[PDB]
Amino acid sequence: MKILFLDQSGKPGGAELCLIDIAKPYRDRALVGLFADGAFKTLLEQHHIPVEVFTNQPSLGQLAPLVAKVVQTAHEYDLIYANTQKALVVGAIASFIARRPLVYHLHDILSPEHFSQTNLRVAVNLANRFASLVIANSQASQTAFIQAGGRAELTKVIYNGFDINLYKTSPSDISKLRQQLGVANNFVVGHFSRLSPWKGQHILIDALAQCPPQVTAILVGDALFGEQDYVKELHQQITRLGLENRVKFLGFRADIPQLMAACDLVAHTSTAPEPFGRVIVEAMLCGKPVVAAKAGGAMELVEHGVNGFLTTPGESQELANIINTCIEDTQKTATIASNAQAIASQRFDVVTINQQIAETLSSL
Amino acid sequence: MKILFLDQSGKPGGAELCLIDIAKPYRDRALVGLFADGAFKTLLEQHHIPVEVFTNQPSLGQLAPLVAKVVQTAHEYDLIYANTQKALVVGAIASFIARRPLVYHLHDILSPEHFSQTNLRVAVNLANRFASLVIANSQASQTAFIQAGGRAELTKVIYNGFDINLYKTSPSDISKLRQQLGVANNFVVGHFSRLSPWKGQHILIDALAQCPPQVTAILVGDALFGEQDYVKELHQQITRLGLENRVKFLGFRADIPQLMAACDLVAHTSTAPEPFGRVIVEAMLCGKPVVAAKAGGAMELVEHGVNGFLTTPGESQELANIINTCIEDTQKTATIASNAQAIASQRFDVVTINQQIAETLSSL
Numbered sequence: 001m002k003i004l005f006l007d008q009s010g011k012p013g014g015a016e017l018c019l020i021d022i023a024k025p026y027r028d029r030a031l032v033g034l035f036a037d038g039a040f041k042t043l044l045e046q047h048h049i050p051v052e053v054f055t056n057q058p059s060l061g062q063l064a065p066l067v068a069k070v071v072q073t074a075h076e077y078d079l080i081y082a083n084t085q086k087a088l089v090v091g092a093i094a095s096f097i098a099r100r101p102l103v104y105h106l107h108d109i110l111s112p113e114h115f116s117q118t119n120l121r122v123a124v125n126l127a128n129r130f131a132s133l134v135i136a137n138s139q140a141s142q143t144a145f146i147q148a149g150g151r152a153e154l155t156k157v158i159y160n161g162f163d164i165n166l167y168k169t170s171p172s173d174i175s176k177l178r179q180q181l182g183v184a185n186n187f188v189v190g191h192f193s194r195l196s197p198w199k200g201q202h203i204l205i206d207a208l209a210q211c212p213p214q215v216t217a218i219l220v221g222d223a224l225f226g227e228q229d230y231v232k233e234l235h236q237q238i239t240r241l242g243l244e245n246r247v248k249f250l251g252f253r254a255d256i257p258q259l260m261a262a263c264d265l266v267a268h269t270s271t272a273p274e275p276f277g278r279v280i281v282e283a284m285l286c287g288k289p290v291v292a293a294k295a296g297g298a299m300e301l302v303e304h305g306v307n308g309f310l311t312t313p314g315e316s317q318e319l320a321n322i323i324n325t326c327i328e329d330t331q332k333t334a335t336i337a338s339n340a341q342a343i344a345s346q347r348f349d350v351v352t353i354n355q356q357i358a359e360t361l362s363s364l
Numbered sequence: 365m366k367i368l369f370l371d372q373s374g375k376p377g378g379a380e381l382c383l384i385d386i387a388k389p390y391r392d393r394a395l396v397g398l399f400a401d402g403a404f405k406t407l408l409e410q411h412h413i414p415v416e417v418f419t420n421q422p423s424l425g426q427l428a429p430l431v432a433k434v435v436q437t438a439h440e441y442d443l444i445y446a447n448t449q450k451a452l453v454v455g456a457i458a459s460f461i462a463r464r465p466l467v468y469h470l471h472d473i474l475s476p477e478h479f480s481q482t483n484l485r486v487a488v489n490l491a492n493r494f495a496s497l498v499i500a501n502s503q504a505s506q507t508a509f510i511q512a513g514g515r516a517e518l519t520k521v522i523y524n525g526f527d528i529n530l531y532k533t534s535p536s537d538i539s540k541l542r543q544q545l546g547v548a549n550n551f552v553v554g555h556f557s558r559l560s561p562w563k564g565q566h567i568l569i570d571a572l573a574q575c576p577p578q579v580t581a582i583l584v585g586d587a588l589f590g591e592q593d594y595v596k597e598l599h600q601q602i603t604r605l606g607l608e609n610r611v612k613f614l615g616f617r618a619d620i621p622q623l624m625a626a627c628d629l630v631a632h633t634s635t636a637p638e639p640f641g642r643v644i645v646e647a648m649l650c651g652k653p654v655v656a657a658k659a660g661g662a663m664e665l666v667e668h669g670v671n672g673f674l675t676t677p678g679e680s681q682e683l684a685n686i687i688n689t690c691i692e693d694t695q696k697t698a699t700i701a702s703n704a705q706a707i708a709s710q711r712f713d714v715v716t717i718n719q720q721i722a723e724t725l726s727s728l
Contacts, residue, residue, distance in 0.1 A: 056426075056428075060450055060453065063399075063420070063431075063450060063454060064454075066427055066428060089424060090427055099489070118423060122424060122461060125460075125463070126461070129460065
């Protein structure tokens with residue numbers, strides 16, 4: 001089985017990173033076709049995954065040369081695996097023209113709040129008619145596809161997988177890192193995300209206002225071209241609350257597992273429902289208490305008070321109450337954190353996930 | 365029922381001319397989408413048929429801009445009617461994305477000799493899966509569709525239609541035209557098609573060499589694009605045979621019916637099977653003796669000795685024998701000519717053809 005993976009983006013978003021992991025086992029018999037050049041192409045090359053950028057530059061493919069290129073490529077492969085919406089449109093056309101089955105891996109919540117109805121109708125219809133299988137990254141994604149008119153019987157939920165041993169950090173690396181960061185005597189709440197209003201860093205900051213003074217926040221991630229007004233707003237907020245010495249912006253970091261290990265609590269505080277929070281799973285695999293916003297995929301990841309905490313999105317006082325619970329009940333909090341590592345290792349191990357994908361592919 | 369008609373060409377070939385007739389009854393509720401500009405667009409505008417040129421110039425349509433525009437226009441129509449092969453490719457895609465039924469009007473013989481196998485395999489598979497109906501312009505086109513793997517049960521034969529009264533010309537007009545052509549005392553063999561090796565002008569010319577000297581030929585049509593070497597070769601063969609004053613090249617003429625009426629015999633001498641000879645029917649509706657090459661649609665249009673004559677393609681002697689038969693049995697030849705008018709009026713009347721199209725469409 002040769003796979004032609006298709007993905008519309010040149011940028012490594014959540015779906016693209018997941019595709020690295022999905023594709024690696026097949027990298028001697030696969031090609032990732034991108035519709036844009038970018039950093040994602042480079043990351044695929046760094047991982048020895050063949051990659052090609054298909055463009056609309058000039059079979060009778062002069063009619064639609066992008067499509068015609070994809071079709072022509074597809075003849076050499078046995079299956080087309082579309083990883084994003086536009087890849088699903090093009091992959092659907094290519095699928096019947098080249099006579100190859102199609103899998104759609106749905107990484108989005110197909111909500112009419114975030115996608116135009118046109119795009120939704122087209123995506124749903126093409127999936128329903130041409131896709132042999134729709135892989136959904138969560139029950140939340142699966143339910144949204146169905147509510148939009150997708151055929152429920154086509155769907156199977158397969159969660160994102162992780163190399164679980166990448167998330168183990170020694171006590172002595174932890175202690176050093178907290179020292180260098182200057183947070184060794186603090187209760188450290190980490191937020192790991194790009195700085196964006198949807199990601200809710202301002203909610204953590206409002207909750208910090210309600211936390212004892214030894215509580216400090218580390219914000220890990222970078223700002224982006226589109227959301228400069230937000231970064232300005234965070235800085236002002238923090239100074240307006242008098243929190244300038246209790247919030248550290250670390251910028252973009254590659255050592256996320258280690259940083260997580262050095263936190264005392266990891267907060268996910270997104271204000272819009274997400275399909276699967278990678279960060280929430282990462283925090284759990286690091287053996288850390290995690291608090292998340294109760295929406296989208298998060299609810300399937302965490303059982304409240306068992307292996308993490310869930311709070312109403314956008315509500316800073318409920319988040320502060322969790323943080324305070326974590327300070328005051330040290331024992332319960334370590335047990336939860338230990339439950340989290342155990343359960344996440346069981347559900348989200350990339351070995352298990354890759355087996356599920358392989359079984360599901362041989363099923364067709 | 366609003367119809368969106370699709371045709372790849374901006375030039376008025378047989379398929380496009382046929383499309384003027386097909387669309388006329390629908391012109392208050394139709395649009396002809398072309399994939400190139402040209403003389404066919406102006407013609408359509410002269411017949412008050414709404415027309416648009418769709419191109420690949422930059423909704424989800426950045427990926428395939430031609431297809432996106434067709435798809436978006438197709439939303440406002442009820443049926444997509446694809447009149448050429450590239451229109452079937454685009455139309456089929458649009459049919460599925462916009463959720464509209466597709467009719468494919470097949471005007472070509474789908475042969476590997478004239479179309480690449482890839483374009484055949486694509487067109488046949490798209491037709492088979494998405495077309496509700498494949499209208500073939502003849503049994504020969506129908507059979508070639510089937511022989512290429514097209515689904516026989518999808519097909520129906522509907523011939524091209526003609527306004528039969530356009531082909532009536534008075535004897536006084538005929539006499540005056542013959543005098544102005546300088547052929548009043550000749551036996552005139554007319555040939556009406558573009559100059560191309562495929563159209564076999566050279567076969568008429570060789571036949572003329574074998575004919576009594578009162579036999580002259582009129583060649584009506586412009587040189588086919590690419591075929592200026594052919595034109596040279598004809599002029600040389602003519603000069604070589606002594607026929608320079610026995611062959612007239614009229615160039616492009618609109619007034620075909622009148623030129624036909626001034627002939628004493630109309631010859632179709634094509635060396636490759638053609639799906640439906642318009643000129644053969646027109647000659648018949650002119651009440652003229654017609655000789656045609658025995659291949660492709662010609663065989664369904666003429667019964668040999670009853671309403672015309674059929675000859676082995678590429679054989680100039682057999683053509684000469686027909687011409688001579690026409691010179692020597694005037695009475696028989698006039699009965700055949702008279703028969704051809706009656707039968708062509710019965711079979712190819714546009715009123716009847718339009719009724720078969722309407723009824724076929726309404727059965728969807």
